Design a protein around this nucleic acid. Structure first.
Lengths: 736, 247, 511
RNA sequence: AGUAGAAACAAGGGUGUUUUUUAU
RNA sequence: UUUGUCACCCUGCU
């Protein structure tokens, strides 16, 4: 007998066993070296998928740019990019008649957000492009640099803290002949000109994506900078407000909310006529989604959305499309050359890709360089006609939902219906007609409609069945949603925060998978046992009666010896496990409480130990996780702050660089912002305000305390003297 | 007073006066987060890799006056290096075990009251009775249920009101409390929280988690009540059903 | 307001018909939606449509497979060609000094010939493997002659060891200003891998991964004691399932992999500039009560200055065997096979004598790969969740627990393979043991080709199933799906077996 | 050699000190 | 080979 597992599908329906297909017990694919080649291929494919347009050189930047709008209609079935204007506008104007008043209420909702938001809220987010350093830096360490460079040249309006003023500062930075910037190479000074500054401020970063599952080839993604981020925030706010009011969308929700709407639409089209009709279901994707859809249509849909509104509103809402349509993409890191005869390897940067001799590259690289070469400007590359990942997602979903809305019965004019649900590229459609000649008419209408706005429907990843069975994203419908344990499998393990959060989020993911993903009792017990085993192995915390030689061993046995009740020691200390199905929603220290002796309780929960570190309130009992399909998420867990709540160490490969002056700074900032903690012990819970210096306040709230607690309650009168003495001394030392 | 002493020592040298008298107070929110480190994409791998290092965790410097260097057998318990961009020391995971082994003891009469919302679960589980098991169909509908009893009928505004009045009393700012319920909560916590040494962020967090309402989207097949939901994995399944009345 | 560089930047970023933003806004404002689309679908070419080609019972065709030299073994350790050297000692796994047990097991054997070379390696200088094996024993001797066996031994650095482990072989890093006038200076190679075709040993090796042994390999008992009835139901299901899977060889694979990757990662992080000697040691529980420890061979680690998650560390692997290589030499394309002694296993009264073999190889691993190798124990969950789902699906149409009879009193069978006479079926434990071996092999051979092939054959599966359920499927372009499935089949020995299995399923499903 | 696959790894940075001298 | 005789630090996502 030759065993073959696939034959199981001769008796078991496929959806009842689809978990057996996902090979998610191994490592995911990564990337090696540079991503310059992928970026060049992307630019060239973007300029190839539309080449029948107009070329012009922008006056300010001076770049060759293509305008593929209102170009010729397409003939064959290849991926086009020639979207119309009247089509977009009619889609919007029909969607607004469909949902009355959806735009005005959203604009009202967004105007307050505009008028009350403060600048500090830009310290949240992922890596951002820094043009002072020409690199990638976290959000706060880039906002500080851009503010320091803005206000060191005359541009001081952000001091009111509103973001609506930092915006005006970013704009009026664009009208200066010269700009001073410094470089930590002591330091230095350099003077950048107007158009060099424009190009440095209209630039994106590009790099290859890692740890992605389901594909054989690697791709590339982009990163914005500082001058564009505010207006992006604002338009995304508006688009999210709109999306949360549409039935046919699924983006701004979670897993459970989406499935209810899926079932709802399925049974909506299920039963209004039982015999004299016929339903079909289309599963599939869209192709080259973020290679088409240029900003010059986002501009028109924003101009339509914000109609009959104040003028500053429109002007603040229409700046991100303008910088997108004039963007210039970076290229990457360069290339590496090798000589087999003399054992030499060398790195060339992306700046030499407009002048280097071409006798070094293979055929693919030659034919990529020689086609991108008419666009290179000072490292960047003109990229006008497209988007790229890290973009306006909600607005794309809005356009798609507007396309789907066109298939109502009073619009199609004869018999045909189609409904569905969209969430970016993924779509699921359902068509109706009382015939087999009607289904093709409906599908042809839809397919030809989506070509007039730039949504090219893929044709090698889609299929068409009779209704009752489909697959939306990775969910599978067989008269009901079957469970898929393999997608959430890669999270059953140690997360790597500390010894206290791991135990909580482990049992928490076991519990949340029992509740929704339809796990089972025996499965959960075996998962418990395996998880305790790998926890004990990763943290060197085996039981205290064993012979397994590790390094917390000489010590743990000590705590094992001088202990009365050994069923109180936490698993982090070499003790038992009292977890089970019922005990699964209860914290550890709260469950072993009544069984510990007093010395252990005291020493463990001693609230002055030197390992506990609290920083703010947005990051207490909360940590980010990296799932298998999707972006990083935030998980909140229930723990009790104890000695095992510590923080790991930090990277230190920055000392060998020349940007060491980035450490000095931060250290001083800490040694300052810590003292402000103890003169004002409420700033980590609520944000402090004012426009006075940090020492005026620290001396104002230093004389009240000498006279009110230690001299209005009868404590010593001999310290008051020197307290006032040093307060006066300090308020003199500032020279004022 | 160490406060004014360290202030005067800061503003006595250069490089530290200009920062304190140039940085306004509405700006320290930005420079508090000025870091040269990155949020990590792969935490599991880094934990497994770092656990084999000699000094993987970080403690406050006060360790050097609270914990020795080499214990009874002679294993190092902390190092002589400073962390990247801070004044914290790099220490080994044996120091935690040591502190839990031969360390300073305290009192624990307040830990039940600060974490009441957990001990509710603890002594609600050990007072509950079981019954039969019905192996039958399970039809589930997805609804919106409150995953926390929601102590009061209030919202975020008066929540911050009561929290700042109870934890940060001399910095409430301007307004006073208005109704009777907030005063009652306030004074109850006033009395029962006196002489506490837990960090005030932890007290504020526990009062928020203990006093405000959270709602979620869940599949149910039995009864819609808040004390039932916390035990949901155990009561309902897809093919079976356990009977349970909590105490 | 907008004035300056932004007034012009906006006056360009428009449709190619306008040049002033104010007139653009004036146009967009007073636009009443007319029949634009419906009157523009009439000018498009009629060569853009969505033509349905009906999937019929005669439409599918066999996926095609590559051509070229046969495939070879790519695994960090031997799987079915393994021979243990075992002793008996009352221990638990993870408790003891490795080199001690190594020396004990090395003394258990009796016939140690002088070893020579059966099968040479073609691309590598061949004296070095023999000289390395003729040194591992000397270090073992001088650590048995020493007063207290440590937990680390550092090999001296000799010529053959650096050769095998690849030391001092990365090119030098010099600037472009200097080696700009040299010839043979060009890109790194970025070509497609070399194509290869299927062999026969991969199925024979998947067969052995489903059968039974005479030991116990997994120990799962540490949990809070029961209170409620559902606890007891789960604890009887667990009893039965763990009674079935505790003797499969996939469990031995899981263990022998977790141990190696743990030891190698810890040694890689500990010392970055020495050569360690790690043995492969396993510990099992015999039938009737006994407990044994068993040796598989040795691993020698080189230098590890690992910075990224894709930087490589090299190592030399030496394993024991009794399988002669000449029966299939193309399987062992990157091994140098020796003959290191004789072994006598007595018959009823007669005798059998057989030569004993050592397979040596140079191999390498990354930082991201050791981590995932240390997590091989989720295979159990993937394999048992499906069987629990089946059991709980049958025990809801009867209103009764059904786990009792499934494992001893069985009238249900599932088709699990096929034979010279046709398809055949098995009990529930057979399914449990084949899904587990599939889950183990999915991690022993991971690649981007597996990801691609799975993601693209999951579509054919669903169209075939919709055809089987009378749901009347269709398709827009069927050749492109096949071209995509065939893009991913290049040289990996396990994805090729998967494609052949898919051909077999396609044959039987639409026969 | 090997890892590996559309491009990389097989380590990467800085600090030194200097007109013939009689002896162990 | 070299004007040399020998040392020294640092870093492992920057």
């Amino acid at each position: 007998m030759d065993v073959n597992p696939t034959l199981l599908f001769l008796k078991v329906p496929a959806q009842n066993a689809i978990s057996t297909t996902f090979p998610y017990t191994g490592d995911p694919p990564y990337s090696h070296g540079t991503g310059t080649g992928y970026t060049m291929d992307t630019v060239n494919r973007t300029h190839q998928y539309s080449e029948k347009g107009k070329w012009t050189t922008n006056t300010e930047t001076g770049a060759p740019q293509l305008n593929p709008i209102d170009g010729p209609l397409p003939e064959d079935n290849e991926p086009s990019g020639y979207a119309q204007t009247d089509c977009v506008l009619e889609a919007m104007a029909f969607l607004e008649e469909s949902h009355p008043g959806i735009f005005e209420n959203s604009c009202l909702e967004t105007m307050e957000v505009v008028q009350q938001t403060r600048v500090d809220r830009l310290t949240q987010g992922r890596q951002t492009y820094d043009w002072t350093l020409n690199r990638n830096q976290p959000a706060a360490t880039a906002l500080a640099n851009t503010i320091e460079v803005f206000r060191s040249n005359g541009l001081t309006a952000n001091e009111s803290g509103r973001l609506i003023d930092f915006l005006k500062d970013v704009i009026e930075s664009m009208d200066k002949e010269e700009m001073e910037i410094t470089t930590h190479f002591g330091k230095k000074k350099q003077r950048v000109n107007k158009r060099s500054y424009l190009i440095r401020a209209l630039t994106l970063n590009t790099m290859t994506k890692d740890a992605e599952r389901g594909k054989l080839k690697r791709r590339a993604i982009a990163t914005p900078g500082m001058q564009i981020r505010g207006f992006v925030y604002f338009v995304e706010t508006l688009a999210r407000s709109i999306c949360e009011k549409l039935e046919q969308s699924g983006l701004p929700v979670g897993g459970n909310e989406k499935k209810a709407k899926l079932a709802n639409v399925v049974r909506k089209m299920m039963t209004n006529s039982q015999d004299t009709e016929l339903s079909f279901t289309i599963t599939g994707d869209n192709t080259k989604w973020n290679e088409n859809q240029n900003p010059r249509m986002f501009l028109a849909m924003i101009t339509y959305i914000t109609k009959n509104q104040p003028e500053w509103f429109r002007n603040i809402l229409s700046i991100a499309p303008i910088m997108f349509s004039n963007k210039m993409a970076r290229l990457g890191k360069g290339y590496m050359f090798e000589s087999k005869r003399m054992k030499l390897r060398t790195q060339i940067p992306a700046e030499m890709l407009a002048s280097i001799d071409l006798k070094y590259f293979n055929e693919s690289t030659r034919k990529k360089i020689e086609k991108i070469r008419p666009l290179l400007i000072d490292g960047t590359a003109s990229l006008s006609p497209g988007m790229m990942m890290g973009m306006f997602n909600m607005l794309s979903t809005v356009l798609g939902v507007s396309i789907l809305n066109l298939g109502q019965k009073k619009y199609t004019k004869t018999t045909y219906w189609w409904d569905g649900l969209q969430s970016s590229d993924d779509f699921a459609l359902i068509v109706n007609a009382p015939n087999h000649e009607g289904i093709q008419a409906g599908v042809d209408r839809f397919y030809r409609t989506c070509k007039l706005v730039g949504i090219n429907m893929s044709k090698k990843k889609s299929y068409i069945n009779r209704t009752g069975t489909f697959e939306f994203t990775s969910f599978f419908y067989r008269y009901g949603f079957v469970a898929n344990f393999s997608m959430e499998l890669p999270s059953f393990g140690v997360s790597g925060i500390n010894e206290s959060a791991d135990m909580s989020i482990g049992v928490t993911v076991i519990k949340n998978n029992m509740i929704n993903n339809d796990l089972g009792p025996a499965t959960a017990q075996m998962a418990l046992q395996l998880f305790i085993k790998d926890y004990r192995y990763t943290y060197r915390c085996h039981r205290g009666d064993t012979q397994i030689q590790t390094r917390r061993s000489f010590e743990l046995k000590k705590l094992w010896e001088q202990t009365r009740s050994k069923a109180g020691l936490l698993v982090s200390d070499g003790g038992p496990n009292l977890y089970n199905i019922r005990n699964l929603h209860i914290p550890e220290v709260c469950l072993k409480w009544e069984l510990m002796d007093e010395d252990y309780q005291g020493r463990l929960c001693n609230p002055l130990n030197p390992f506990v570190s609290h920083k703010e309130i947005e990051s207490v009992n909360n940590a980010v996780v990296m799932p298998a399909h999707g972006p990083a998420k935030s998980m909140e867990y229930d723990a009790v702050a104890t000695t095992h709540s510590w923080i790991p160490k930090r990277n230190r490969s920055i000392l060998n660089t020349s940007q060491r002056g980035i450490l000095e700074d931060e250290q001083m900032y800490q040694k300052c912002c810590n003292l402000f903690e103890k003169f004002f012990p409420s700033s980590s819970y609520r944000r402090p305000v004012g426009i006075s210096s940090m020492v005026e306040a620290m001396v104002s709230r230093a004389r009240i305390d000498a006279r009110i607690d230690f001299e209005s309650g009868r404590i010593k009168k001999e310290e008051f003297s020197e307290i006032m003495k040093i307060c006066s001394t300090i308020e003199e030392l500032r020279r004022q | 007073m160490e406060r004014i002493k360290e202030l005067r020592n800061l503003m006595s040298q250069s490089r530290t006066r200009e920062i304190l008298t140039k940085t306004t107070v509405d700006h320290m929110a930005i420079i508090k987060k000025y870091t040269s480190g990155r949020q990590e994409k792969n935490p599991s791998l880094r934990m497994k890799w770092m656990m084999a290092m000699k000094y993987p965790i970080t403690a406050d410097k006060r360790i050097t006056e609270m914990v020795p260097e080499r214990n009874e057998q002679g294993q190092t318990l902390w190092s002589k290096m400073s962390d990247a961009g801070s004044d914290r020391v790099m220490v080994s995971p044996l120091a935690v075990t040591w502190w839990n082994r031969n360390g300073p003891v305290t009192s624990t009469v307040h830990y039940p009251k600060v974490y009441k919302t957990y001990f509710d679960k603890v002594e609600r589980l050990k007072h509950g009775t079981f019954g039969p098991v019905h192996f039958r169909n399970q039809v589930k509908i997805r609804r919106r249920v409150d995953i926390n009893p929601g102590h009061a009928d209030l919202s975020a505004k008066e929540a911050q009101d009561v929290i700042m009045e109870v934890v940060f009393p001399n910095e409430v700012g301007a307004r006073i409390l208005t109704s009777e319920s907030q005063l009652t909560i306030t004074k109850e916590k006033k009395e029962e929280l006196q002489d506490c040494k837990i960090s005030p962020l932890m007290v504020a967090y526990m009062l928020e988690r203990e006093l405000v309402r959270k709602t979620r989207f869940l599949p149910v097949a039995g009864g819609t009540s808040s004390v039932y939901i916390e035990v949901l994995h155990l009561t309902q399944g897809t093919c079976w059903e356990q009977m349970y009345t909590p105490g | 307001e907008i004035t300056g560089t932004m007034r012009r930047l906006a006056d360009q970023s428009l449709p190619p018909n306008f040049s002033c933003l104010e007139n653009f806004r004036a146009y967009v404002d007073g636009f009443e939606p007319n029949g634009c689309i419906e009157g523009k679908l009439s000018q498009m070419s009629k060569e853009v449509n969505a033509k349905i080609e009906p999937f019929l019972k005669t439409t599918p065709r066999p996926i095609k497979l590559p051509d070229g030299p046969p495939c070879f073994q790519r695994s960090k350790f031997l799987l079915m060609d393994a021979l243990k050297l075992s002793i008996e000692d009352p221990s638990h796994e993870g408790e003891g000094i490795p080199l001690y047990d190594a020396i004990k097991c090395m003394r258990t054997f009796f016939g140690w010939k002088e070893p020579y070379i059966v099968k040479p390696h073609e691309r590598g200088i061949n004296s070095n493997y023999l000289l390395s094996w003729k040194q591992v024993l000397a270090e073992l001797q001088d650590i048995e002659n020493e007063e207290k066996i440590p937990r680390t031994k550092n090999m001296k650095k000799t010529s053959q060891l650096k050769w095998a482990l690849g030391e001092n072989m990365a090119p030098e890093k010099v600037d472009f200003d200097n080696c700009r006038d040299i010839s043979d200076l060009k890109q790194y190679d970025s070509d497609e891998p070399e194509l290869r075709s299927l062999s026969s040993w991969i199925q024979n090796e998947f067969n052995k991964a489903c059968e039974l042994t005479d030991s116990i390999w997994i120990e799962l008992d540490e949990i809070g004691e029961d209170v409620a009835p559902i606890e007891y139901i789960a604890s009887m299901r667990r009893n039965y399932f763990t009674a079935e899977v505790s003797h499969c060889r996939a469990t031995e694979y899981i263990m022998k992999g977790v141990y190696i990757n743990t030891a190698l990662l810890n040694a890689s992080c500990a010392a970055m500039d020495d050569f360690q000697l790690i043995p492969m040691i396993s510990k099992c529980r015999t039938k009737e009560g006994r407990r044994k420890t068993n040796l598989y061979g040795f691993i020698i680690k080189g230098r590890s200055h690992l910075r990224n998650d894709t930087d490589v560390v090299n190592f030399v692997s030496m394993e024991f065997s009794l399988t002669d290589p000449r029966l299939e030499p193309h399987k062992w394309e990157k091994y140098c096979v020796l003959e290191i002694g004789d072994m006598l296993l007595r018959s009823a009264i007669g005798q059998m004598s057989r030569p004993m073999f050592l397979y040596v190889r140079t191999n390498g691993t990354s930082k991201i790969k050791m981590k995932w190798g240390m997590e091989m124990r989720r295979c159990l969950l993937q394999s048992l969740q499906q069987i629990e789902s089946m059991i709980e699906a049958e025990s809801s149409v009867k209103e009764k627990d059904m786990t009792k009879e499934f494992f001893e009193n069985k009238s249900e069978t599932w088709p699990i393979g096929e034979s010279p006479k046709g398809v055949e079926e098995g009990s529930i434990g057979k399914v449990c043991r084949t899904l587990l071996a599939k889950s183990v092999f999915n991690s022993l051979y991971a690649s981007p080709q597996l990801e691609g092939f799975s993601a693209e054959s999951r579509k054919l599966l669903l169209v075939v199933q919709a055809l089987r359920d009378n749901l009347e499927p269709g398709t827009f372009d069927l050749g492109g799906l096949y071209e995509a499935i065939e893009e991913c089949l290049i040289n990996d020995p396990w994805v090729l077996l998967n494609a052949s299995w898919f051909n077999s399923f396609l044959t039987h499903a639409l026969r």
